[PDB]
């Protein structure tokens, strides 16, 4: 007996289903590490990350909400993006869009 214990049923959860996604190769060209969040507009991440910014337009990382992806200096890896929804209006970040799209 364990007070307040969970009895989670076995299986898996499919995240962000029914949404456009794309893979992108990203390379950290900075001298310090960089870490990106799940809902951050990818096309506006730290300028030291080299990748096709044009493709990541309106996308965010296809990872469980709240988690993050790290890039050590000089690191290169392929990440999967998922398209923003709702009104698809970006406000904030580095302020490159500040409106719909």
């Amino acid at each position: 007996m364990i007070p307040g214990e969970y009895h989670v049923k076995p299986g898996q959860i499919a995240l962000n289903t029914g949404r456009a996604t794309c893979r992108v190769v990203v390379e950290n060209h900075g001298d310090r590490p960089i870490q990106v969040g799940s809902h951050y507009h990818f096309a506006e991440v730290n300028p030291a990350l080299k990748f096709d910014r044009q493709q990541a337009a309106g996308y965010r990382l296809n990872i469980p909400a709240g988690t993050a992806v790290r890039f050590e200096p000089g690191q290169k890896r392929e990440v999967e993006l998922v398209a923003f929804a709702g009104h698809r209006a970006v406000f904030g970040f580095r302020g490159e869009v500040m409106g719909p799209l």
């Binding site: 007996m1 364990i2 007070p3 214990e5």
Partner: protein
């Protein structure tokens, strides 16, 4: 003495620990509050003696064993934290999974 609010608060932890200490001596299996109180006071005295944070983080896991506390209690305490005045000022001691 000029006892500040925090020094008086700790007198509460100390007194709670006296209750647990006597009960364990009678040979009872300790409950949730009794456990936390007992291990927490252990650590405070550790700092008073001048033991380092690192030493106590380890010793804190050998105060009570799974066979000395009630069922479910070890899982009810994922870690224990208490601050005390060490020779080099106030420091935080975190003991992860104290009861095994």
């Amino acid at each position: 003495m000029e006892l500040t609010p925090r020094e008086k608060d700790k007198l509460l932890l100390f007194t709670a620990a006296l209750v647990a200490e006597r009960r364990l001596a009678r040979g009872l299996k300790l409950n949730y509050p009794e456990s936390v109180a007992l291990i927490s006071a252990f650590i405070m005295e550790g700092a008073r003696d001048g033991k380092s944070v690192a030493s106590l983080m380890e010793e804190g896991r050998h105060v009570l064993t799974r066979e000395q506390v009630m069922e479910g209690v070890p899982e009810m305490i994922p870690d224990i934290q208490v601050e005390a005045t060490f020779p080099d000022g106030s420091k935080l001691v975190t003991v992860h999974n104290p009861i095994i």
